Fold this sequence. Notes:
Chain A is mostly helical. In chain A, 44% of the residues lie in helices and 0% in strands. Chain A is built from 1 helix and no strands. Chain A has one helix at residues 6-12. Chain A is elongated, with a radius of gyration of 7 Å. In chain E, helix 3 (29-41) packs across helix 4 (51-73) and helix 4 packs across helix 9 (171-200). In chain E, 65% of the residues lie in helices and 3% in strands. The radius of gyration of chain E is 18 Å and the shape is globular. The interface between E and G is medium-sized, with 30 and 26 residues.
Amino acid sequence: TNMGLEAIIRKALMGK
Amino acid sequence: TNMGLEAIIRKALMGK
Amino acid sequence: GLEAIIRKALM
Amino acid sequence: GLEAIIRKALM
Amino acid sequence: NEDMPVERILEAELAVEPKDPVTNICQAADKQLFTLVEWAKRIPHFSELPLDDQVILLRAGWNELLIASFSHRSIAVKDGILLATGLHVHRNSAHSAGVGAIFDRVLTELVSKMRDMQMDKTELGCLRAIVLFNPDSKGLSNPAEVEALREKVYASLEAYCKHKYPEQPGRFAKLLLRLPALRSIGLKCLEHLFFFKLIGDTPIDTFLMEML
Amino acid sequence: NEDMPVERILEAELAVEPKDPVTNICQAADKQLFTLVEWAKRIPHFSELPLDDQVILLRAGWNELLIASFSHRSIAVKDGILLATGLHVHRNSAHSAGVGAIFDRVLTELVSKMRDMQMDKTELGCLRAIVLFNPDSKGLSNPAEVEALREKVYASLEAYCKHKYPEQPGRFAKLLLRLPALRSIGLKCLEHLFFFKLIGDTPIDTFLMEML
Amino acid sequence: NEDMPVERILEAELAVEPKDPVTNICQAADKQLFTLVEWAKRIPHFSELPLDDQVILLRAGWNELLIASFSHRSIAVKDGILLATGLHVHRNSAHSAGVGAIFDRVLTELVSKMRDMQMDKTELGCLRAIVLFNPDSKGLSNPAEVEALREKVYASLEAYCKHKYPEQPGRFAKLLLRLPALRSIGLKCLEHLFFFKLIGDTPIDTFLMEML
Amino acid sequence: NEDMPVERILEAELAVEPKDPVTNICQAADKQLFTLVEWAKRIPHFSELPLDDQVILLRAGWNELLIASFSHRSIAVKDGILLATGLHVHRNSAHSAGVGAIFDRVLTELVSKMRDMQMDKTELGCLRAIVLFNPDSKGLSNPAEVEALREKVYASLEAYCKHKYPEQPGRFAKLLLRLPALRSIGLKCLEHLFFFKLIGDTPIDTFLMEML
């Protein structure tokens, strides 16, 4: 639901 | 809702 | 006590 | 931190 | 003039005075039944209400009424709670039950604030009747009568307050304002009560045996 | 006496007034925030409050303050409520969306009784001001003062009623006895909100968003 | 090998088969009880079970057993479910009554996948038999046996699949992987039930009915 | 033949091995994030899935996956639970947190049953991927692909089992059946998680700050 977590997991594939 | 408690309170006015 | 009801059906 | 948002309105 | 005499509500309060931590509240059910109802009958005009209403009001107030009682009772105790059944309760003990959340509030929003205003039995009794005469209860055959009765209780209680403490000109509102505090503490118990049956599971779906 | 004034609190209510049913309250979160934050600084003695306690009080009062408002607004209509979002909900819809329960308690316990007594904006605002100044609020840096702002408001509120309305000499108390209603509906709402999240989509455990 | 047989479990399912949406499940509580109790004694090795453990297992399996059933029954219809009450619920209604959430998980997670694999009554019954023989059940007098009746059923169930369906050599596992679905929907249902009670009428705290 | 090599899932399991009681799980969020995702990438074909699916599966499995890990980890411990962060937990300690209810089940339905079958890292890993490849998750761009991937994981895991223990002909079903147990333990945490934010109140309505 384009939620500000979705994002942090999104980046997390590839770097934190 | 004629519930088996309603009854026990009903009698309770007057005796247990 | 629900048990009772079941038991009474379990026989 | 919700505080922040309120504070920022509280001024 | 009075026709909801405070003296009567006092008499009623006094008449019912008592004469696993969590699990100990639950089996007390039968004595609480007697204590609620013997108390209620002694409020003026409660008995005049259609019998079918009487059931609702009690059903409705059951919680808050019990909670209001033990809170006052424990103004004696130190950082504890005394139950109608005589067992005291302590924070460490309660929190080791997850009811810490109620306990805190009971103590900081009721037990201690009553301790603070040196709340008395007439006052407590009156607030208790106000809780009882709750016209928002569902199914009342006649919401309005209850409204009226409610209004008398608080009329006399105002008059009482003024009389006994003409200096504290706010005690009446002070008192009324212990009420939302009390209503929410009640729901908070149901929330625990419910979460316990639920999470405990163990014997969890015993909702059957509601006409089953 | 106006060591805490009234027609100003009216002015306050007047300032903030506006010149699928669930989502709409979860739309407007920004606006309610607008409405709510300003109103508090316009309350006499409100801003003088430590910045930190200003906070606790808005956080704690959020729901009620916000519910009290739409309740009083819907005095204007039979059969529904009117949100600050300039939209208006209906009994059939709300029910159809599974919040009929909360919907009904608002109309039966808050709108209808606000109508029935024909409550006005000084009254409304004054109840709110009460709700805002809540001593029982958690973690007040100075609480034992916050009681005073409350002490100070209800007092002033006794008067407005006492003059505008001396035929009814307990209208005041009638006023305070809607606060419990307002709590309980405040927590019921909260319960629904937690529920909907819970039976919510897999996007149910996103608490991980606390993240620290 | 049939140290625990299969076509009998089919017979078992066949025996018990029948030749406002919420209430209907709270109507029929008696019938479900009928259906459910008999089916268990018709399960090989089931009655030989101590009378006490017979009980735990029916109590524990109640919901799932009962849900699995109507799920498999509604394979028969697009867009809805068919209750043993000889009635048939619809997506629009359920939604309209605020259980759309649970309604949808059943069709998406249980009916559609049961359809998609075109599950049959030996399969159904066998999954159930699994659910019924649950070692993790609380307070089993002898549990470490109950595992065996399960061990014994799934085994037999490997075969039925292995012959009737050798093109699909993991149809078996596909079968077991609907059990998690069934738990979770079993608890979701339970959650709703607790919720509805809770926002329930004042007749919310009638737990006092435990009374001992 | 294999193209979901068990050796790879083993490699993934091993790759992530670690190298107030309640409150201590919550701040660990960041390391869990890394541990879940670094693990997931190492399952074959997970990276091939549309990136937007990858998010869902993890979002979806977050709970069960974490729970599956610590349960195995604690097959070392005695009547305790070891967290990725190295802190052990004990029943007396937990029950003094109300999570006794999870703790019991974790231990009696997962920790101990894994201890019992001497469950190993390949097996655990496989069940873990099965949990991950969960095609019932909402919003999947293509439920079916996940279905397929799920099916391979359990195909290889069957084959694995048979190979390594030709004597225990049930271990594969045994394993699959730890799954409903695991799914429900997950929801039970959310139920606590939720009841805590709720009842704790204190900072309770912090739902604002969902786009607020």
